[PDB]
Structures are given as structure tokens and as C-alpha cells.
Structure 1
Amino acid sequence: QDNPAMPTSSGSEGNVKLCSLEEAQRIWKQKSAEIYPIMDKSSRTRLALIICNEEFDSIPRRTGAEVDITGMTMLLQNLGYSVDVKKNLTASDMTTELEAFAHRPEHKTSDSTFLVFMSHGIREGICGKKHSEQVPDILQLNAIFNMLNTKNCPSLKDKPKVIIIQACRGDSPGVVWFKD
């Protein structure tokens, strides 16, 4: 006795549109042998990590970063993940947190993970809170992959690991002119 014009956004999934049982069964019946398996909703322990730097020792404050933390935390919870939020870390601190994250026993009873990094960035990688041109504090994307791979995170073997990065990758505007 619900009204389709009044969408329910009041559940744990919030504003994320739901996958109906019919659509879920349709998605599987098309290419089951080529979809990542999902664990029982009642017992799985999905985890996600958000690392976000807003305050820096030598570079400008990333005003609006709290809005990004809010949106990504709520989205990841809406998708069924328990979210850890770590803020204002050096690249060394990020490495320690990522290593701790890979060591979490919940991954053994999880089907996937999301890692979200949001900071200042340069071509080389993501800025840690102590970054300066003089003494760099950079976490490279290669290090993130290494810490979460089949060897360093065996609990996530054969499970999708989605990495989201919000950070400049240099100083260019990324455009060229053309005759319209």
C-alpha cells in the first residue's frame, strides 16, 4: 500500500536506488559465471576505509573536504559497508592505517572492499599532511595496490577492491582549444 511517486529513501540504503529481487535475478541469469559472488546479507561483515586530509602543515586547507567525507561515508554505508574514517595523516600514517586495514578479520567474512583517498595531490601521488616542495610527503598509488594485494591482504583474495582517489595529478588545466 505504498505510493511510487513517494520514493522511500528512509532505509539503510538511503538515496541509493534499490535492486529489485526480479532485477537481481535478471542480472544473474544474463552472466552468472562472470559476476563477483556476494555473501549473505545477514552474516557478511563488509568494511570500507576513507582517508581524508583537510588540514596541512605547509599547504592550504582543503575547505569542503568534510562534505566529501559525509557523502562518501553515507554512500558506502548505504551500499552495506562499515566505514572507518581516518583524517589528517602523513604518508607514513596512511601506510600504517592501510596495513592495519588489510589485517582486519572482517575481510574474511566480506565479499569486497572500497578504499577512498581524498587529499592534495601532485603527479607523483597523494599528499600527506606534512607535504612541502622542500620535504615531500607522498603516498604513491603503487603502495596502495601492494598493501591490498593477494599477498599482503590474503583475506581479500578473489574479492573486488575498489580504490577511489580525489586528488590533483599535477598543475595543468587538462584542456586544448579546437576550432568549433
Structure 2
Amino acid sequence: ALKLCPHEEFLRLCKERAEEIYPIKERNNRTRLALIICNTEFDHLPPRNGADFDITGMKELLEGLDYSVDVEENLTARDMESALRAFATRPEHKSSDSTFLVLMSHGILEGICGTVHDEKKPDVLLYDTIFQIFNNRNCLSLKDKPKVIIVQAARGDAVYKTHVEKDFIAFCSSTPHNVSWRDSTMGSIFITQLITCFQKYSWCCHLEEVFRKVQQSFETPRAKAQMPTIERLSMTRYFYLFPGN
């Protein structure tokens, strides 16, 4: 179960450490949005069994964190771009303090596979495209607001403009996975551990602390090969979720 931060601690932390913390909008008017894109059936790649467990767990976790969740399934890389660009113009971001993007598919080094991906003829949503669509120029509604990118994607001059890509954090599991009968039985180990660490720790620890406890659980001999990684960190503050408020 998702543990809740007391209303007392909510008021205290927000007042006493305001300069250090992403500001939270108050619950009544708040309209947080989150997006899940999950590809499970592929024209030239093996199916991803058990991904429904990951959708179910993340959707419900994000709803507990007071996000309204959209789910999109089995898109081409081009339709993933259009879905992301459409999500970025959604009016409800104006009355929100943050967003989550959850992206689940096969992966390559540079990005996320769309449904028609092939070695001959790649179909990839590049990671660089995701940050571009949501940067400080192309998505004003979310500027200065945390943009949390959750990626589950198992594998088999003029760049100084890092004034524009700010307040992102990406938490990715792109290490290979051995397909097995078990996949139809349970979700991905990354998504499972993510969910439980949000449940145990988000009431008292900020987002980066939650992520680091996730990584801690992967520090065993048989599990460290699947360790998830924090990437493209550009947060300028700590992000406390304050479950319940």
C-alpha cells in the first residue's frame, strides 16, 4: 500500500524548505496528468508478455499519487511522437505541478522501438526527441516543473543549448532480459521494484531518494546485471510527491 505523508509534514516541508523544493499545487484545483505508452505486439520482434502487469501497477500507482493517467498501446515510432506532442499541449498541464511519462517497449541504445521496428528499417523514438518535445521552448505549461521519464526498454557544434532542457530526470531499465514462460506470470522486475519503493518511501523521501532505494534493491549478485540507471538529470530542486496531499 502507498504510505501517506501527514498534512502537518506537508505544510512544514513546503514552507521551511521552499527554495529547495519543487512547489506543489494545492489538491482542489490540481490537475496532474501522466502518460503511459506500452508496445506489446510487434511486426518483427517477439511479443512482450506480462506488460499488462506493468501498465496496471504503474497506472494505479500514479493514480494514488494524484495523476490522471492516459494509456496508449502499440504505436509506430511516428505515432509515439504525435502522442507525445499532443500530450505536451494538453491544457491540464497549466494547473499541474509536474508530469510522468512511462514508456515501455523493446529498446535500442538510442531509443524506444515502435511496433514496426526492424534491423533493415528502424522504427525508433529517440530519447533526444522526447526531451525536445517537452523542453522549455516547446512545452511552456510544464517549464520549471519536474518531468519524470520512466523507461522500460530492454535491449537485445551547437549542443550548448542546455539552458532549454531542464527539470528532467529519466529512470531507465535498458539491460537485456531473458524471455521466459515467467514473463506471462509477472511484470518487469524494474517496474515492480519501482512501485514498491514508491509505496514504502515516497511519503518521506524525494524522487531521487526513491530512485536510489530502487537501485539499492538491485545490489545483489544475481540482480546487479539488471540494475536501472538515472539519466539526463537536469532537476534544479528536490521533488517531494507528498502522497495524500
TM-score strictly above 0.5: yes
Map of 2:57 onto structure 1: 71
Is 1:103 matched up with 2:83?
A: no
Map of 2:70 onto structure 1: 84
Give aligned pairs, total.
Answer: 161
Is 1:38 matched up with 2:24?
A: yes
* Distance change (3 Å), C-alpha of 1:39 and 1:172: closer
Is 1:112 matched up with 2:98?
A: yes
Separation of aligned partners in 2, 1:119 and 1:26: 40
Please say which of residues 27-36 and 96-105 is displaced more in the overlay. Answer: 27-36
Q: Identity, % of aligned pairs?
A: 61
In structure 2, stretches of 5+ residues that fail to align are 157-174, 178-223, 226-245
Map of 2:162 onto structure 1: none
Residue 24 (structure 1) shift: 1.9
Residue 97 (structure 1) shift: 0.2
In structure 1, stretches of 5+ residues that fail to align are 1-14, 176-180
Match of 2:153 among 138, 145, 167: 167
Contact 1:54–1:62 (Cα < 8 Å) also in 2? yes
Residue 52 (structure 1) shift: 0.3
Per the alignment, in what secondary structure is the counterpart of residue 94 of structure 1?
Answer: helix
Separation of aligned partners in 2, 1:154 and 1:25: 27
TM-score between the two structures when normalised by the length of structure 1 = 0.84
Structure 1 stretches of at least 4 aligned residues deviating more than 4 Å after TM superposition: 169-175
TM-score between the two structures when normalised by the length of structure 2 = 0.62
For residues 70-113 of structure 1, what are the alpha-carbon distances to aligned partners after superposition, in whole Å with 9 as ceiling and x for unaligned? 00100111100001100000110000000000010000111100
Contact 1:120–1:126 (Cα < 8 Å) also in 2? yes
Q: For residues 118-129 of structure 1, what are the structure 2 equivalents within 5 Å?
A: 118-129=104-115
* Distance change (3 Å), C-alpha of 1:172 and 1:120: closer
Per the alignment, in what secondary structure is the counterpart of residue 47 of structure 1?
Answer: strand
- Compute the RMSD of aligned alpha carbons: 1.7
Map of 2:117 onto structure 1: 131
Per the alignment, in what secondary structure is the counterpart of residue 152 of structure 1?
Answer: coil
Residue 29 (structure 1) shift: 5.2
Contact 1:125–1:169 (Cα < 8 Å) also in 2? no
Residue 20 (structure 1) shift: 0.5
